[PDB]
Design a protein around this ligand. Structure first.
Ligand SMILES: [Zn+2]
Ligand SMILES: [Zn+2]
Lengths: 325, 320
């Protein structure tokens, strides 16, 4: 049913000081936030935002920015702020724009603002949508992904067909069309970040003697999980990188460790190792979606052939799916 | 032997604003920390501590206070109160730094590095996760119903002055000053018999190469890894126990710079040759906790290594 603009558009529009619309995913009942980068707030833009939204304007901020300004500290009423200098009553699109710009600017300090005001700063979790799939996080992410300050400006879009309510997905689609805006999902943003940012790093490297010969064992960690995955590497991979034999084997405790007979997992790792070792060149990934994909590209794999019995945007070429004995 | 006070007494003593003395166990060779609750730090109390300890004052903290103040994330870090103290060394001043680390409303900007107080970060779970004097301090503080922040320092020997006081003297010292002397072992036991601390996550009937085992997933409420327990027969005296540390290289990939693989196998088999036994796969604080939950009172331990406060008694030690 629903068609979405790409993340590549959203970043570029954000970078150009234009606004985008963000929904969580494809579900038709979703409300949408209109979003621009706080440091791109002009009177024209804020006035546009105020026109079509609830008018309860928010400024999603990076933890680092929050702490510099003594705001929303990591450890009931809503905290609001107004720029202390350069504004009038603090409610017009200009004043609100000045406030947003000020929050974004890396030089500004606590007493450059007065509490209360007409702008709601919000605290985005460290690491963006990957750690918390909220509109707040998407706003800081988009700003940062566009090479700007990790400061965004958001407010929800009211409906026009049903006066009483907030716009849902289908109406946001035409709103986005009519006004030349991108409409994107947090879902699409999450997985774009997963496919275009390196979240892995090498921790350890050892060469291990086995029954199947020596394997180069490289340990990898994820910046977004507390686990070492290990890739076992035979021979030279890059210079080349093509036609690499690969097995991706997700960890099975009962199977791999205890030799459980009611699963073929254990036998399969061993067979994969054997096969790779016979070919004198390959990769058996021991995994504990594909973070494994990023490991492969880090290993200099360009084109591969997967070892598997069951018949992506990473620059990995699947050539032939091939059985384990 | 050597008389020990109850934990029940130690906790009430902490709550009252008094101090206690803590050792590991009944062993004559042990050194002892003097401990009170950080929030209960007075000039009188700190002065008492400075008098009889090495004067190297430490404040064990709950990881939450550590993060909250930005000290010791995961050179010796020291700290002093920013306001309301003089040079820092005096009992009054040092008492103030202790009190202010213990307070929930104090912030990073309330303190100055460097200072005259060593803040220590206790492991999550206190003594049930690490049997240290540092963990003992927050545990007592918390059990007393106060902020999880304590203060410790070791007691210098009065009899042999170049040295730190050992068990004998520590009891004498407690008697002298009307303080409670307790062991970490006795602290562990109070806790584990009083608190939820370990859970069963799953059970299954793992059919191995050496017959059939009953596989049981244990988790600690302080860490989110799941250890597996492989049990044969009914468990609870004289059981053959092997506690095996995960070794990915060796257990899984059959590395040969390692020998861990053929070890786990040998254990499973040896336990199988007998109708009875436990093989723990750990991914031994939590280890012990699991064994008592299985219902082990005594055990023959499979290890190649000599030298508690849980239920367990090591009957013998068996190799290979
Ligand atoms: Zn399996
Ligand atoms: Zn090993």
């Amino acid at each position: 049913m629903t068609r979405l603009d790409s993340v590549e558009r959203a970043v570029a529009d954000i970078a150009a000081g234009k606004a985008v619309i963000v929904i969580d995913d494809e579900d038709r009942e979703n409300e949408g936030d209109l979003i621009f980068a706080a440091e791109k707030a002009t009177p024209e833009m804020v006035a546009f935002m105020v026109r079509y939204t609830s008018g309860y304007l928010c400024v999603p901020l990076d933890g680092a920015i929050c702490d510099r300004l003594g705001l929303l500290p990591m450890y009931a009423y809503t905290v609001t702020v107004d720029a202390r200098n350069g504004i009038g009553t603090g409610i017009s699109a200009s004043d609100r724009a000045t406030t947003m710009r000020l929050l974004a600017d890396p030089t500004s300090v606590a007493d450059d603002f007065t509490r209360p005001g007409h702008v709601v700063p919000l605290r985005a979790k460290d690491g963006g949508v990957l750690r918390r799939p909220g509109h707040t996080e998407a706003a800081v992410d988009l700003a940062r992904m566009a090479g700007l300050q990790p400061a965004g400006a958001i407010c929800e879009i009211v409906s026009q067909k049903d006066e009483g309510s907030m716009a849902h997905t289908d109406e946001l689609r035409v709103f986005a069309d009519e006004h030349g805006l991108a409409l994107i999902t947090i879902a699409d943003l999450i997985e774009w970040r997963r496919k275009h940012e390196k979240h892995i790093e090498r921790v350890a490297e050892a060469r291990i003697p086995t029954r199947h010969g020596e394997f180069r064992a490289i340990g990898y960690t994820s910046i977004y999980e507390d686990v070492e995955h290990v890739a076992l590497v035979r021979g030279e991979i890059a210079g080349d990188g093509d036609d690499v034999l690969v097995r991706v084997h997700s960890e099975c405790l009962t199977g791999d460790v205890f030799g459980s007979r009611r699963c073929d997992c254990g036998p399969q790792l061993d067979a994969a190792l054997a096969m790779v070792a016979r070919e004198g060149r390959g990769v058996v990934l021991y995994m504990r979606y594909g973070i494994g994909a990023q490991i492969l590209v880090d290993l200099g794999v360009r084109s591969m052939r997967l070892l598997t019995n069951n018949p992506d945007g990473y620059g990995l070429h699947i050539i032939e799916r091939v059985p384990l004995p």
